[PDB]
Amino acid sequence: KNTSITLGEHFDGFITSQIQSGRYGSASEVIRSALRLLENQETKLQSLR
Amino acid sequence: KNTSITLGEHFDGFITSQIQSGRYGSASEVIRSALRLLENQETKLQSLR
Amino acid sequence: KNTSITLGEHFDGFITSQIQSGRYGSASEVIRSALRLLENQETKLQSLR
Amino acid sequence: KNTSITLGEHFDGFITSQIQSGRYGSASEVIRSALRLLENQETKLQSLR
Amino acid sequence: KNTSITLGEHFDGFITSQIQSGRYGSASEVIRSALRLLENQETKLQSLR
Amino acid sequence: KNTSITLGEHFDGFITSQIQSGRYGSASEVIRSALRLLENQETKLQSLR
Amino acid sequence: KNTSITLGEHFDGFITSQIQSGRYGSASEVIRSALRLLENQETKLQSLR
Amino acid sequence: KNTSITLGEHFDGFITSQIQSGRYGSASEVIRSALRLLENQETKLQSLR
Amino acid sequence: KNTSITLGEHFDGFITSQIQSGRYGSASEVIRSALRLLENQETKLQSLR
Amino acid sequence: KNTSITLGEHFDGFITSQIQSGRYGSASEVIRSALRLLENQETKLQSLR
Amino acid sequence: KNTSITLGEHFDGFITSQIQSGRYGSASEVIRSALRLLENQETKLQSLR
Amino acid sequence: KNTSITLGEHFDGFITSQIQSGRYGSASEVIRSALRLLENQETKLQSLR
Amino acid sequence: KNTSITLGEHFDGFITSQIQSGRYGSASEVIRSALRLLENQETKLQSLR
Amino acid sequence: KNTSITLGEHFDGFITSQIQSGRYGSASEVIRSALRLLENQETKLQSLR
Amino acid sequence: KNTSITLGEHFDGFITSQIQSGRYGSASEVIRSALRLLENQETKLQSLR
Amino acid sequence: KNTSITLGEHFDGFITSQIQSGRYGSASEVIRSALRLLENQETKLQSLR
């Protein structure tokens, strides 16, 4: 719980702009959806080997 | 940069397991790679419309 | 049954524009089709792991 | 904003299960992600016809 | 058999367009082909889960 | 409006069964999703020529 | 319309198998679907040459 | 044997035209090739599930 | 018209076994379908160069 | 061995044109290559069903 | 006309075995079909760049 | 090894042009690569049946 | 731990520009992501064999 | 020139495994191949926007 | 003309075994075919961009 | 060790172009990458028979 992360200005602006578009709610939503993408990709990877 | 966000225990464990495999260095690396994946998806999407 | 959702203005506009095409009937139809897509994605995901 | 939807017991259970997996936060998060999936499908579709 | 279904004006126009091209004979035919597609999808789905 | 169509005694059972799983609403909803699938298959196949 | 065609016993059995499954209604229906496939092939062909 | 089938006034012209190009023999030949195409599409699509 | 061909025993057996399946009618049908396949391959080839 | 086939003028012209391109030697060569193409198609097909 | 080629024993045996199978006539047939394959592959390559 | 075969002017020119591009050394190299392509096709084919 | 590598000036500038794009943090992060891509390509190669 | 970086024990073992296989000469070779792959990815990315 | 290259023992044995397989003539032929594969991979990369 | 081979002026220019781009270090690197590609091809080949 409560993890400290050091992101660049690029991804800060990216998260803010994703919030502005109305497609995402909070920054937690954006990061959790991106991590869902990454976890699904990794699960697809190890499904082979 | 230097922000604290409370993620679920599932995603905390996922990030830790990804770090323990040796592929990723820090949790910042994992979150940056996830954001890169999401940004590339969005770039492939909005390039059409 | 009888759930209250807080959707953004962007997603309300998306649902309305989907209804305007005539392909979908109501907002419930659009949300049900979206949940069907997500459930199919999950059923294809967890089939591996 | 403020939408009252009467989802079936199957979709209520699916939303609750996606919450319990730790991948999704709230029910609104699941519904927004499913709507994002449908929106991306349609954005890939209407780019052709 | 012999069921009353309120299809949207868009889908009514689509069924008429498919009929008047000569490729399909009746509205029952176009609906049966669409249901064949959907049943193939669902049978490929529930075979996994 | 409210078109009467003589479907086979097999697609009737399939529509009802798809309703029973809690994934679809009415028979009109299943028929509409199937017509959407046929329209999307059209748009994807007629994309070449 | 109303043409006499000598189809082989294999294709007669195939048309019957497609009919008695409930997915197709008449032999005209199965032949029309097959001709749709063949016409799509030829239209994609002669569009090139 | 020698089945009588009521095809539309459009597939009639298509069959004749395909005969006129010197690529097919009789109407039975065109119908047989189309049925072969449908059977092969079946064998290729039902290969997954 | 009225051409004499010197086919090997292997190809005579292939044509006969194709006729035995019921998908094709005569040896002329098999040879015509083979020439159609080769002509389609060529028409797709020379479309580039 | 020794097969008398009455090919249409279209296929006679196609065989002669394939001979004139310098890619094929005789008409029997073109017919054997087309039969090889059909045999490979069927060998790829029957491996599934 | 009349070109001298130095092939290994591997491809000599390969050409002879392709003749034995009845799929090819002479060694010229085998080599010309292989060169047709190579020319089609090269034409597909330079179709892009 | 050290065999003379009369190929068509088309294939002679094709081989010469392939040698002039600098990719292939001799005509033996070109014919060996073509035979490798055909042998790999045959290996992928007969591996099934 | 601690490995010395002499990369080209092209890759030096590329790594520095990837750091400057905000998508990557340090040079080690670019190297780790590239090695992840390489390992995933290897794994996808081993998917078939 | 002569830069020192510390990759994880995972990536150290990975580079050593790639060298002991004989495919890659130095660690510089493995890193340059990975950087080529990642540069291909990023260049395909930036071509859209 | 005349270039000196120090390849690994793995690739030395691989080239000698490819020569021994009868598929390739000399070491120069293996090297030229591998460089052809590499150039074709590059060209296929430039197909999109 | 220290083997000398003569590749064509085409392949000489190719290796030089790959070096001047900064992607590949030596000519040994380019040749080793090409040999890796060809070894992947041949290993995927021999896995069948």
Q: Tokens 């045996």 appear where?
A: K13
Q: What's the token pair of residue P2? A: 């220290």
CA–CA min distance A26, chain C (Å)? 11
Using the Cα atoms of residue F32, residue F35, residue F41 and residue F47 in order, give the sign of their dihedral.
negative
Is H35 in Cβ contact with G31 (below 8 Å)?
yes
CA–CA min distance O26, chain P (Å)? 11
Under a CB-based contact definition with an 8 Å cutoff, are residues K26 and K14 in contact?
A: no
**Using what technique was this structure determined?**
X-ray
CA–CA min distance A1, chain M (Å)? 24
Q: What's the token pair of residue M42? A: 């290897």
The one-letter amino acid code at C22 reads G
Q: What is the CB neighbour count within 10 angstroms for residue J36?
A: 17
Chain J residues closer than 8 Å to H25 by CB = 8
Mapping DSSP onto H, E and C, the string for C11-29 reads HHHHHHHHHHCCCCCCHHH
Q: Give the side-chain half-sphere CA count within 13 A for E10.
A: 12
Under a CB-based contact definition with an 8 Å cutoff, are residues L11 and K32 in contact?
A: yes
Q: Give the Cα separation of K4 and J31 in Å (integer).
A: 28
Q: Select from D8, D10, D48 the Cβ nearest to the Cβ of F43.
A: D48
Q: Select from G10, G48, G49 the Cβ nearest to the Cβ of I22.
A: G10
L-O contacts (CB, under 8 Å): 20
DSSP string, F1-49: --EEE---HHHHHHHHHHHHTTS--SHHHHHHHHHHHHHHHHHHHTTT-
Resolution in A: 3.1
* Closest-approach residue (CA) in chain J for I33: J38
The total number of residues written for chain M in this structure = 49
Q: Give the side-chain half-sphere CA count within 13 A for P30.
A: 29
Neighbouring subunits of N (3+ Cβ pairs under 8 A):
B, M, O, P
* Closest-approach residue (CA) in chain M for A7: M25
Neighbouring subunits of C (3+ Cβ pairs under 8 A):
A, D, E, F
Q: What is the CB neighbour count within 10 angstroms for residue D7?
A: 21
Q: Tokens 């006969």 appear where?
A: I16
Q: Strand ranges (DSSP E) for chain E?
A: 3-5
Q: Give the Cα separation of A24 and L4 in Å (integer).
A: 72
Q: Give the Cα separation of I41 and I43 in Å (integer).
A: 6
Strands D3-5 and L3-5 come out as unpaired
Q: Strand ranges (DSSP E) for A1-49?
A: 3-5
Q: Give the Cα separation of P45 and P37 in Å (integer).
A: 12
SS3 content of chain C, % helix, strand, coil (to 5): 65, 5, 30
Q: Tokens 């539309």 appear where?
A: H8
Of B33, B45, D36, which Cα lies nearest the Cα of A24? Answer: D36
Q: From its phi and psi, is residue K22 left (phi > 0), alpha (psi between -120 and 50) or beta?
A: left
Chain D residues closer than 8 Å to B10 by CB = 21-23
Collapse the DSSP code of L4 into the 3-class scheme (helix H, G, I; strand E, B; otherwise coil) and give the result. strand
Q: Torsion angle of alpha carbons K17, K23, K26, K27, nearest 10°?
A: -50
Q: Which residues of H touch I (CB under 8 A)?
A: 23-25, 28-29, 32-33, 35-36, 39
Task: Output phi, psi for M38, to 5 deg.
Answer: -65, -45
Q: Give the side-chain half-sphere CA count within 13 A for I46.
A: 10
Q: Give the Cα separation of A20 and L46 in Å (integer).
A: 58
Is I25 in Cβ contact with G10 (below 8 Å)?
no
Q: Give the Cα separation of A42 and A46 in Å (integer).
A: 6
> Which residue, among I17, I18, I23, I30, would best test binding to G if mutated, counting the most G CBs under 10 Å from its CB?
I23
Q: Give the Cα separation of G12 and G6 in Å (integer).
A: 9
Under a CB-based contact definition with an 8 Å cutoff, are residues F8 and G25 in contact?
A: yes
Q: What is the CB neighbour count within 10 angstroms for residue N13?
A: 12
Q: What is the CB neighbour count within 10 angstroms for residue B39?
A: 17
Neighbouring subunits of F (3+ Cβ pairs under 8 A):
C, D, E, G
Under a CB-based contact definition with an 8 Å cutoff, are residues F49 and G43 in contact?
A: yes
DSSP string, P1-49: --EEE---HHHHHHHHHHHHTTS-SSHHHHHHHHHHHHHHHHHHHHTT-
The total number of residues written for chain I in this structure = 49
CA–CA min distance E45, chain F (Å)? 12
CA B42 to chain CA centroid, nearest Å: 15
The beta-carbon contacts of O37-46 under 8 Å, at least 24 apart in sequence, are O37/P34, O37/P37, O37/P38, O37/P41, O38/P30, O38/P33, O38/P34, O38/P37, O39/L23, O39/P14, O40/K45, O41/P37, O43/K45, O43/K48, O43/K49, O44/K48, O45/N40, O46/K48, O46/K49
Q: Torsion angle of alpha carbons I33, I36, I42, I48, nearest 10°?
A: -120
Chain N residues closer than 8 Å to M35 by CB = 7, 11, 14, 30-31, 34
Under a CB-based contact definition with an 8 Å cutoff, are residues M10 and P22 in contact?
A: yes
CA P8 to chain CA centroid, nearest Å: 13
Q: What is the CB neighbour count within 10 angstroms for residue P49?
A: 8
Q: What is the CB neighbour count within 10 angstroms for residue H16?
A: 12
Under a CB-based contact definition with an 8 Å cutoff, are residues P32 and N19 in contact?
A: no
DSSP string, chain N: --EEE---HHHHHHHHHHHHTTS-SSHHHHHHHHHHHHHHHHHHHHTT-
